[model samples]
Target chain A: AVELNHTIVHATDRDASARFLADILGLAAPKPFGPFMVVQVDNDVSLDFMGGSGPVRPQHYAFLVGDSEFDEIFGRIRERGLDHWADPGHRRPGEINTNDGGRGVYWSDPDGHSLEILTRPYGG
Target chain B: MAVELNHTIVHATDRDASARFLADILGLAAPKPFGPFMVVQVDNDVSLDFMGGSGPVRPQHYAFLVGDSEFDEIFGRIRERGLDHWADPGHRRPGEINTNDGGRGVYWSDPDGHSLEILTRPYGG
Candidate 1:
Protein backbone atom coordinates (compact mmCIF):
# COMPACT_ATOMS: atom_id res chain seq x y z
CA ALA A 1 0.00 0.00 0.00
CA VAL A 2 1.18 3.55 -0.73
CA GLU A 3 1.36 5.41 2.54
CA LEU A 4 2.16 9.09 3.14
CA ASN A 5 5.61 9.41 4.69
CA HIS A 6 5.91 13.21 4.62
CA THR A 7 5.62 16.10 2.28
CA ILE A 8 8.75 17.69 0.83
CA VAL A 9 8.61 21.44 1.30
CA HIS A 10 11.06 23.81 -0.35
CA ALA A 11 12.29 26.47 2.00
CA THR A 12 14.83 29.25 1.91
CA ASP A 13 16.14 28.31 5.33
CA ARG A 14 15.95 24.64 6.20
CA ASP A 15 17.35 24.57 9.71
CA ALA A 16 15.49 27.66 10.81
CA SER A 17 12.19 26.39 9.46
CA ALA A 18 12.71 22.96 11.00
CA ARG A 19 13.37 24.51 14.37
CA PHE A 20 10.27 26.59 13.94
CA LEU A 21 7.99 23.59 13.65
CA ALA A 22 9.89 21.87 16.44
CA ASP A 23 9.48 24.82 18.77
CA ILE A 24 5.90 25.55 17.79
CA LEU A 25 4.66 21.98 17.99
CA GLY A 26 6.89 21.03 20.92
CA LEU A 27 8.34 18.22 18.79
CA ALA A 28 11.73 16.66 19.22
CA ALA A 29 14.69 18.50 17.74
CA PRO A 30 14.69 18.17 13.97
CA LYS A 31 17.21 15.89 12.31
CA PRO A 32 19.35 17.27 9.53
CA PHE A 33 19.22 15.40 6.22
CA GLY A 34 21.93 16.72 3.95
CA PRO A 35 20.92 20.31 3.37
CA PHE A 36 17.36 19.71 4.53
CA MET A 37 15.99 19.26 8.04
CA VAL A 38 13.38 16.60 8.65
CA VAL A 39 10.64 17.30 11.18
CA GLN A 40 9.51 13.72 11.64
CA VAL A 41 6.11 12.89 13.01
CA ASP A 42 4.15 9.78 13.94
CA ASN A 43 3.30 7.04 11.38
CA ASP A 44 6.47 7.79 9.41
CA VAL A 45 4.86 11.07 8.46
CA SER A 46 7.17 14.04 8.32
CA LEU A 47 7.83 17.45 6.82
CA ASP A 48 11.13 17.76 4.97
CA PHE A 49 12.16 21.39 4.80
CA MET A 50 14.62 21.77 1.98
CA GLY A 51 17.14 24.59 1.86
CA GLY A 52 17.15 26.42 -1.45
CA SER A 53 18.48 29.54 -3.14
CA GLY A 54 15.47 30.55 -5.19
CA PRO A 55 12.17 31.74 -3.78
CA VAL A 56 10.18 29.00 -2.04
CA ARG A 57 6.89 27.80 -3.37
CA PRO A 58 3.54 28.35 -1.72
CA GLN A 59 2.21 25.44 0.30
CA HIS A 60 -0.21 24.44 3.04
CA TYR A 61 0.13 22.22 6.11
CA ALA A 62 -2.25 21.19 8.90
CA PHE A 63 -1.83 19.67 12.35
CA LEU A 64 -4.15 17.88 14.75
CA VAL A 65 -4.54 18.79 18.43
CA GLY A 66 -6.47 17.68 21.49
CA ASP A 67 -9.20 19.79 23.07
CA SER A 68 -7.02 21.12 25.90
CA GLU A 69 -4.01 21.76 23.72
CA PHE A 70 -6.28 23.58 21.31
CA ASP A 71 -6.94 26.23 23.95
CA GLU A 72 -3.28 26.76 24.70
CA ILE A 73 -2.24 26.72 21.08
CA PHE A 74 -5.13 28.88 19.98
CA GLY A 75 -4.08 31.34 22.65
CA ARG A 76 -0.61 31.26 21.21
CA ILE A 77 -2.04 31.85 17.76
CA ARG A 78 -3.84 34.90 19.04
CA GLU A 79 -0.62 36.18 20.58
CA ARG A 80 0.91 36.00 17.11
CA GLY A 81 -2.07 37.88 15.60
CA LEU A 82 -3.10 35.11 13.22
CA ASP A 83 -6.69 35.35 12.18
CA HIS A 84 -8.58 32.27 13.42
CA TRP A 85 -11.92 30.99 12.25
CA ALA A 86 -14.26 28.11 12.88
CA ASP A 87 -13.83 26.97 9.30
CA PRO A 88 -11.02 26.34 6.86
CA GLY A 89 -12.02 29.02 4.32
CA HIS A 90 -12.46 31.44 7.21
CA ARG A 91 -16.22 31.24 7.33
CA ARG A 92 -17.13 32.20 10.95
CA PRO A 93 -15.02 34.32 13.28
CA GLY A 94 -14.49 33.77 17.03
CA GLU A 95 -16.52 30.64 16.72
CA ILE A 96 -13.97 27.78 16.66
CA ASN A 97 -17.10 25.78 15.86
CA THR A 98 -17.21 22.18 17.04
CA ASN A 99 -19.11 20.48 14.30
CA ASP A 100 -20.21 16.98 15.26
CA GLY A 101 -17.51 17.32 17.94
CA GLY A 102 -14.28 18.80 16.45
CA ARG A 103 -12.80 22.30 16.52
CA GLY A 104 -10.21 24.02 14.28
CA VAL A 105 -8.36 27.16 13.08
CA TYR A 106 -5.85 28.15 10.39
CA TRP A 107 -2.80 30.37 10.01
CA SER A 108 0.49 30.79 8.16
CA ASP A 109 3.97 29.50 8.88
CA PRO A 110 7.15 31.54 8.88
CA ASP A 111 7.52 30.90 5.13
CA GLY A 112 4.01 31.87 4.13
CA HIS A 113 2.76 28.32 3.99
CA SER A 114 -0.84 27.96 5.10
CA LEU A 115 -1.08 25.93 8.29
CA GLU A 116 -3.94 24.67 10.44
CA ILE A 117 -4.72 23.27 13.87
CA LEU A 118 -7.82 21.29 14.53
CA THR A 119 -9.42 18.82 16.90
CA ARG A 120 -11.50 16.02 15.50
CA PRO A 121 -11.79 15.75 11.70
CA TYR A 122 -13.90 18.05 9.51
CA GLY A 123 -17.53 17.48 8.47
CA GLY A 124 -19.71 16.97 11.45
CA MET B 1 1.57 27.96 19.19
CA ALA B 2 -1.82 26.83 17.95
CA VAL B 3 -0.25 23.48 17.06
CA GLU B 4 -1.84 21.58 14.23
CA LEU B 5 -3.85 18.59 15.38
CA ASN B 6 -4.92 17.88 11.83
CA HIS B 7 -6.20 19.43 8.63
CA THR B 8 -9.85 18.83 8.02
CA ILE B 9 -10.65 17.37 4.59
CA VAL B 10 -14.07 16.77 3.05
CA HIS B 11 -15.05 13.34 1.78
CA ALA B 12 -17.91 12.22 -0.39
CA THR B 13 -17.54 8.66 0.87
CA ASP B 14 -16.52 9.04 4.48
CA ARG B 15 -15.61 5.55 5.76
CA ASP B 16 -13.93 4.48 2.55
CA ALA B 17 -11.80 7.62 2.47
CA SER B 18 -10.70 7.05 6.07
CA ALA B 19 -9.70 3.46 5.34
CA ARG B 20 -7.84 4.53 2.20
CA PHE B 21 -5.44 6.86 4.00
CA LEU B 22 -5.05 4.40 6.88
CA ALA B 23 -4.24 1.40 4.70
CA ASP B 24 -1.96 3.44 2.45
CA ILE B 25 -0.05 4.96 5.32
CA LEU B 26 -0.20 1.90 7.64
CA GLY B 27 -1.57 4.30 10.20
CA LEU B 28 -3.44 3.25 13.29
CA ALA B 29 -7.10 2.69 12.56
CA ALA B 30 -8.99 5.96 12.57
CA PRO B 31 -11.06 7.16 15.51
CA LYS B 32 -14.61 8.30 14.87
CA PRO B 33 -15.28 11.92 15.86
CA PHE B 34 -18.84 13.00 15.47
CA GLY B 35 -19.57 12.42 11.79
CA PRO B 36 -15.94 12.40 10.66
CA PHE B 37 -12.99 10.04 11.16
CA MET B 38 -9.55 11.17 12.27
CA VAL B 39 -6.34 9.42 11.26
CA VAL B 40 -3.94 10.54 13.95
CA GLN B 41 -0.20 10.43 13.58
CA VAL B 42 2.73 11.10 15.85
CA ASP B 43 2.98 14.52 17.44
CA ASN B 44 -0.52 16.05 17.62
CA ASP B 45 -0.57 15.63 13.83
CA VAL B 46 -3.50 14.04 12.04
CA SER B 47 -5.66 13.98 8.87
CA LEU B 48 -9.33 14.49 9.54
CA ASP B 49 -11.91 13.34 6.96
CA PHE B 50 -15.18 15.18 7.29
CA MET B 51 -18.34 13.54 5.91
CA GLY B 52 -20.40 16.04 4.01
CA GLY B 53 -23.30 16.19 1.57
CA SER B 54 -21.54 18.39 -0.96
CA GLY B 55 -18.54 17.68 -3.18
CA PRO B 56 -15.17 17.74 -1.44
CA VAL B 57 -12.65 20.46 -1.95
CA ARG B 58 -9.69 20.08 -4.28
CA PRO B 59 -6.56 20.05 -2.17
CA GLN B 60 -2.89 19.04 -2.37
CA HIS B 61 -0.63 17.05 -0.03
CA TYR B 62 2.95 15.76 -0.10
CA ALA B 63 5.12 13.03 1.48
CA PHE B 64 8.86 12.63 2.11
CA LEU B 65 10.83 9.42 1.52
CA VAL B 66 14.40 8.14 1.70
CA GLY B 67 16.42 7.02 -1.34
CA ASP B 68 16.11 3.24 -0.85
CA SER B 69 12.38 3.40 -0.24
CA GLU B 70 12.01 5.74 -3.21
CA PHE B 71 12.73 2.85 -5.54
CA ASP B 72 10.31 0.44 -3.91
CA GLU B 73 7.60 3.07 -3.59
CA ILE B 74 8.21 4.31 -7.11
CA PHE B 75 7.56 0.77 -8.20
CA GLY B 76 4.33 0.94 -6.25
CA ARG B 77 3.54 4.27 -7.85
CA ILE B 78 4.01 2.70 -11.27
CA ARG B 79 1.71 -0.19 -10.37
CA GLU B 80 -1.00 2.21 -9.32
CA ARG B 81 -1.18 4.13 -12.68
CA GLY B 82 0.10 7.29 -11.00
CA LEU B 83 2.79 9.29 -12.74
CA ASP B 84 6.18 9.51 -11.07
CA HIS B 85 8.23 12.64 -11.10
CA TRP B 86 11.39 13.50 -9.20
CA ALA B 87 10.07 16.97 -8.46
CA ASP B 88 7.07 18.11 -6.50
CA PRO B 89 6.05 20.81 -9.02
CA GLY B 90 7.03 18.33 -11.74
CA HIS B 91 10.22 19.95 -12.99
CA ARG B 92 12.67 17.17 -14.01
CA ARG B 93 10.71 14.04 -15.02
CA PRO B 94 13.26 11.43 -14.04
CA GLY B 95 16.77 11.72 -12.55
CA GLU B 96 15.11 12.58 -9.19
CA ILE B 97 17.75 15.32 -9.03
CA ASN B 98 19.59 15.36 -5.74
CA THR B 99 20.06 19.07 -5.20
CA ASN B 100 22.01 18.47 -1.99
CA ASP B 101 21.58 14.82 -1.01
CA GLY B 102 17.94 13.82 -0.41
CA GLY B 103 15.95 11.88 -3.09
CA ARG B 104 12.22 12.18 -3.87
CA GLY B 105 9.03 11.81 -6.03
CA VAL B 106 5.38 12.89 -6.50
CA TYR B 107 2.01 11.19 -7.10
CA TRP B 108 -1.76 11.62 -6.89
CA SER B 109 -4.04 10.33 -4.10
CA ASP B 110 -7.30 8.46 -4.48
CA PRO B 111 -9.22 11.55 -3.49
CA ASP B 112 -7.39 13.64 -6.12
CA GLY B 113 -5.10 15.57 -3.81
CA HIS B 114 -1.88 16.59 -5.53
CA SER B 115 0.77 15.01 -3.29
CA LEU B 116 4.51 15.42 -3.46
CA GLU B 117 7.60 14.17 -1.56
CA ILE B 118 11.35 14.36 -1.45
CA LEU B 119 14.48 13.71 0.56
CA THR B 120 17.40 15.97 1.50
CA ARG B 121 16.65 19.59 2.29
CA PRO B 122 16.22 21.72 -0.84
CA TYR B 123 19.13 24.16 -0.55
CA GLY B 124 22.41 22.97 0.81
CA GLY B 125 22.55 24.36 4.32
Candidate 2:
Protein backbone atom coordinates (compact mmCIF):
# COMPACT_ATOMS: atom_id res chain seq x y z
CA ALA A 1 0.00 0.00 0.00
CA VAL A 2 1.14 3.56 -0.68
CA GLU A 3 1.31 5.32 2.64
CA LEU A 4 2.53 8.90 2.34
CA ASN A 5 3.10 10.29 5.74
CA HIS A 6 5.00 13.33 7.08
CA THR A 7 6.39 16.39 5.38
CA ILE A 8 7.34 19.92 6.51
CA VAL A 9 7.14 23.35 4.93
CA HIS A 10 9.91 25.92 5.11
CA ALA A 11 8.40 29.38 4.95
CA THR A 12 9.54 33.00 5.34
CA ASP A 13 7.09 33.35 8.17
CA ARG A 14 5.97 30.35 10.13
CA ASP A 15 2.94 31.77 11.80
CA ALA A 16 1.68 33.41 8.65
CA SER A 17 2.11 30.32 6.57
CA ALA A 18 0.46 28.22 9.21
CA ARG A 19 -2.48 30.58 9.28
CA PHE A 20 -2.67 30.54 5.52
CA LEU A 21 -2.72 26.77 5.55
CA ALA A 22 -5.38 26.64 8.23
CA ASP A 23 -7.60 28.94 6.25
CA ILE A 24 -6.92 27.31 2.94
CA LEU A 25 -7.45 23.82 4.26
CA GLY A 26 -10.49 25.00 6.19
CA LEU A 27 -8.97 24.00 9.47
CA ALA A 28 -8.60 25.69 12.81
CA ALA A 29 -5.89 28.19 13.62
CA PRO A 30 -2.43 26.75 14.02
CA LYS A 31 -1.49 25.39 17.37
CA PRO A 32 1.99 25.45 18.80
CA PHE A 33 3.90 22.31 17.99
CA GLY A 34 7.05 22.72 19.99
CA PRO A 35 8.74 25.79 18.46
CA PHE A 36 6.66 25.71 15.34
CA MET A 37 3.17 26.55 14.06
CA VAL A 38 1.42 23.41 12.94
CA VAL A 39 -1.92 22.93 11.20
CA GLN A 40 -3.46 19.66 12.15
CA VAL A 41 -5.58 17.66 9.75
CA ASP A 42 -8.16 15.03 10.47
CA ASN A 43 -6.01 12.27 9.01
CA ASP A 44 -3.21 12.96 11.49
CA VAL A 45 -1.24 15.01 9.01
CA SER A 46 0.63 17.92 10.48
CA LEU A 47 2.01 20.65 8.25
CA ASP A 48 4.72 22.38 10.27
CA PHE A 49 6.11 25.81 9.53
CA MET A 50 9.18 27.78 10.72
CA GLY A 51 9.89 31.47 10.34
CA GLY A 52 12.59 34.17 9.98
CA SER A 53 13.74 32.90 6.61
CA GLY A 54 13.51 34.24 3.09
CA PRO A 55 12.94 32.09 0.05
CA VAL A 56 15.17 29.27 1.20
CA ARG A 57 14.02 27.66 -2.05
CA PRO A 58 11.02 27.17 -4.21
CA GLN A 59 8.97 24.04 -3.58
CA HIS A 60 5.50 22.75 -4.51
CA TYR A 61 2.89 20.92 -2.41
CA ALA A 62 -0.03 18.92 -3.80
CA PHE A 63 -2.90 18.02 -1.49
CA LEU A 64 -4.88 14.92 -2.27
CA VAL A 65 -8.60 15.52 -2.01
CA GLY A 66 -11.77 13.52 -2.51
CA ASP A 67 -13.90 13.59 -5.64
CA SER A 68 -16.81 15.14 -3.77
CA GLU A 69 -14.77 18.21 -2.93
CA PHE A 70 -13.37 18.58 -6.42
CA ASP A 71 -16.11 20.72 -7.89
CA GLU A 72 -16.35 23.06 -4.94
CA ILE A 73 -12.58 23.52 -4.82
CA PHE A 74 -12.10 23.76 -8.56
CA GLY A 75 -14.99 26.18 -8.79
CA ARG A 76 -13.34 28.26 -6.14
CA ILE A 77 -10.19 28.18 -8.20
CA ARG A 78 -11.98 29.36 -11.31
CA GLU A 79 -14.17 31.91 -9.54
CA ARG A 80 -11.14 33.34 -7.83
CA GLY A 81 -9.47 33.50 -11.24
CA LEU A 82 -6.36 31.90 -9.85
CA ASP A 83 -3.47 31.32 -12.24
CA HIS A 84 -3.95 27.78 -13.48
CA TRP A 85 -1.54 25.70 -15.48
CA ALA A 86 -1.81 22.41 -17.33
CA ASP A 87 1.37 20.79 -16.17
CA PRO A 88 4.67 21.46 -14.51
CA GLY A 89 6.36 21.56 -17.89
CA HIS A 90 3.78 24.06 -19.16
CA ARG A 91 3.75 21.90 -22.28
CA ARG A 92 0.01 21.47 -22.04
CA PRO A 93 -2.45 24.26 -22.85
CA GLY A 94 -5.11 24.40 -20.13
CA GLU A 95 -4.67 25.89 -16.69
CA ILE A 96 -6.43 22.99 -14.95
CA ASN A 97 -5.77 19.58 -16.42
CA THR A 98 -7.29 16.23 -15.58
CA ASN A 99 -4.81 13.47 -14.99
CA ASP A 100 -5.37 10.06 -16.50
CA GLY A 101 -8.40 9.65 -14.23
CA GLY A 102 -9.07 12.59 -11.88
CA ARG A 103 -9.34 16.34 -11.44
CA GLY A 104 -6.55 18.75 -10.38
CA VAL A 105 -5.64 22.42 -10.27
CA TYR A 106 -2.61 24.56 -9.38
CA TRP A 107 -2.43 27.98 -7.79
CA SER A 108 -0.08 30.26 -5.86
CA ASP A 109 0.06 31.65 -2.37
CA PRO A 110 0.83 35.11 -1.01
CA ASP A 111 4.55 34.35 -1.25
CA GLY A 112 4.08 33.20 -4.81
CA HIS A 113 4.49 29.64 -3.67
CA SER A 114 2.77 27.01 -5.78
CA LEU A 115 0.01 24.95 -4.16
CA GLU A 116 -2.09 22.23 -5.76
CA ILE A 117 -5.19 20.22 -4.91
CA LEU A 118 -6.25 17.06 -6.66
CA THR A 119 -8.86 14.37 -6.25
CA ARG A 120 -6.34 11.58 -6.66
CA PRO A 121 -2.65 11.49 -5.79
CA TYR A 122 -1.96 10.23 -9.32
CA GLY A 123 -4.75 9.02 -11.49
CA GLY A 124 -2.21 7.28 -13.69
CA MET B 1 -1.75 9.54 17.38
CA ALA B 2 0.30 12.25 15.68
CA VAL B 3 1.10 11.24 12.14
CA GLU B 4 3.23 13.65 10.15
CA LEU B 5 2.31 12.82 6.58
CA ASN B 6 3.00 13.28 2.87
CA HIS B 7 4.16 16.47 1.15
CA THR B 8 5.22 17.65 -2.33
CA ILE B 9 7.77 20.04 -3.82
CA VAL B 10 6.94 22.86 -6.24
CA HIS B 11 9.92 24.29 -8.08
CA ALA B 12 11.01 26.19 -11.16
CA THR B 13 12.52 23.13 -12.74
CA ASP B 14 10.87 19.90 -11.64
CA ARG B 15 13.70 17.50 -12.45
CA ASP B 16 16.69 19.60 -11.36
CA ALA B 17 15.18 20.72 -8.09
CA SER B 18 14.05 17.18 -7.43
CA ALA B 19 17.63 16.10 -8.05
CA ARG B 20 18.88 18.77 -5.65
CA PHE B 21 16.50 17.52 -2.99
CA LEU B 22 17.48 13.92 -3.70
CA ALA B 23 21.16 14.84 -3.31
CA ASP B 24 20.65 17.03 -0.26
CA ILE B 25 18.48 14.46 1.44
CA LEU B 26 20.47 11.60 -0.13
CA GLY B 27 17.92 9.83 -2.33
CA LEU B 28 17.77 8.32 -5.76
CA ALA B 29 16.90 10.27 -8.91
CA ALA B 30 13.30 11.50 -8.85
CA PRO B 31 10.79 9.47 -10.81
CA LYS B 32 7.81 11.08 -12.47
CA PRO B 33 5.08 12.08 -9.99
CA PHE B 34 2.16 12.26 -12.37
CA GLY B 35 3.41 15.25 -14.38
CA PRO B 36 6.48 15.93 -12.25
CA PHE B 37 9.50 14.27 -10.65
CA MET B 38 8.94 12.76 -7.25
CA VAL B 39 11.27 11.53 -4.52
CA VAL B 40 9.77 8.75 -2.43
CA GLN B 41 11.20 8.11 1.02
CA VAL B 42 11.67 5.03 3.14
CA ASP B 43 8.90 6.19 5.48
CA ASN B 44 6.45 6.38 2.58
CA ASP B 45 6.78 10.16 2.51
CA VAL B 46 6.38 11.42 -1.04
CA SER B 47 7.94 14.75 -2.09
CA LEU B 48 6.57 15.50 -5.54
CA ASP B 49 7.77 18.25 -7.88
CA PHE B 50 6.27 20.45 -10.59
CA MET B 51 8.13 22.63 -13.12
CA GLY B 52 8.03 25.61 -15.52
CA GLY B 53 7.79 27.96 -12.59
CA SER B 54 9.92 30.78 -11.22
CA GLY B 55 11.02 31.31 -7.65
CA PRO B 56 7.32 31.14 -6.73
CA VAL B 57 8.65 32.39 -3.44
CA ARG B 58 11.00 31.62 -0.60
CA PRO B 59 10.38 28.74 1.74
CA GLN B 60 12.38 26.85 4.37
CA HIS B 61 12.31 23.15 5.26
CA TYR B 62 13.81 21.57 8.40
CA ALA B 63 14.57 17.87 8.31
CA PHE B 64 14.36 16.23 11.71
CA LEU B 65 17.12 13.67 12.18
CA VAL B 66 18.27 11.10 14.69
CA GLY B 67 20.71 12.23 17.39
CA ASP B 68 23.57 9.87 16.61
CA SER B 69 24.26 11.29 13.15
CA GLU B 70 24.51 14.93 14.23
CA PHE B 71 28.23 15.63 14.71
CA ASP B 72 29.65 13.94 11.63
CA GLU B 73 27.19 15.78 9.41
CA ILE B 74 27.52 19.13 11.16
CA PHE B 75 31.29 18.89 10.83
CA GLY B 76 30.97 18.02 7.18
CA ARG B 77 28.94 21.21 6.76
CA ILE B 78 31.69 23.26 8.44
CA ARG B 79 34.50 21.60 6.50
CA GLU B 80 32.76 22.29 3.21
CA ARG B 81 32.71 26.05 3.90
CA GLY B 82 28.96 26.23 3.52
CA LEU B 83 27.17 29.43 4.57
CA ASP B 84 25.75 28.88 8.02
CA HIS B 85 23.48 31.25 9.87
CA TRP B 86 22.00 31.36 13.36
CA ALA B 87 18.20 31.16 13.43
CA ASP B 88 15.50 32.17 11.00
CA PRO B 89 15.86 35.71 12.35
CA GLY B 90 19.62 35.71 11.87
CA HIS B 91 19.67 36.99 15.43
CA ARG B 92 22.19 34.95 17.39
CA ARG B 93 25.91 35.18 17.12
CA PRO B 94 27.96 32.72 15.03
CA GLY B 95 26.87 30.64 12.05
CA GLU B 96 26.07 27.18 13.39
CA ILE B 97 23.67 27.71 16.27
CA ASN B 98 22.64 25.12 18.78
CA THR B 99 18.92 24.94 19.43
CA ASN B 100 17.35 25.44 22.82
CA ASP B 101 18.37 21.88 23.57
CA GLY B 102 20.69 20.12 21.13
CA GLY B 103 22.74 20.60 17.95
CA ARG B 104 21.40 22.47 14.90
CA GLY B 105 22.79 24.12 11.78
CA VAL B 106 21.18 26.29 9.08
CA TYR B 107 22.49 26.85 5.57
CA TRP B 108 21.26 28.07 2.19
CA SER B 109 20.79 26.21 -1.08
CA ASP B 110 21.94 26.97 -4.63
CA PRO B 111 18.88 29.24 -4.85
CA ASP B 112 19.49 31.07 -1.58
CA GLY B 113 16.95 28.91 0.18
CA HIS B 114 17.51 27.90 3.79
CA SER B 115 18.04 24.24 4.66
CA LEU B 116 18.32 23.15 8.28
CA GLU B 117 19.54 20.09 10.13
CA ILE B 118 19.15 19.39 13.81
CA LEU B 119 19.62 16.43 16.09
CA THR B 120 16.63 16.69 18.38
CA ARG B 121 14.03 18.40 16.24
CA PRO B 122 14.72 21.47 18.39
CA TYR B 123 17.08 19.83 20.86
CA GLY B 124 15.14 21.48 23.61
CA GLY B 125 18.77 16.82 20.07
Count of clashes, each model: 24, 16
Which candidate achieves the best DockQ against the true structure?
1
Candidate 1's error at A25, in angstroms?
Answer: 2.0
lDDT of 2 by residue, A1-124 (tens): 1222234666777788788756655567888866688776544346677664444454566666667655665666666566667675546534677775776767766566667777655432
- Top candidate, metric lDDT: 1
Residues A1-107, candidate 1, lDDT per residue (tens digit)?
23445556667778887887676666789988655688865445667788767766555567766678777777777776766667656677666666657776666
lDDT of 2 by residue, B1-125 (tens): 11223356544444466445534443334445444444444233444443434444343453444344543554465446555545433435555555544444343343435344333343210
List chain B TM-scores, each candidate. Answer: 0.47, 0.55
- List DockQ, one per candidate, in order: 0.22, 0.19
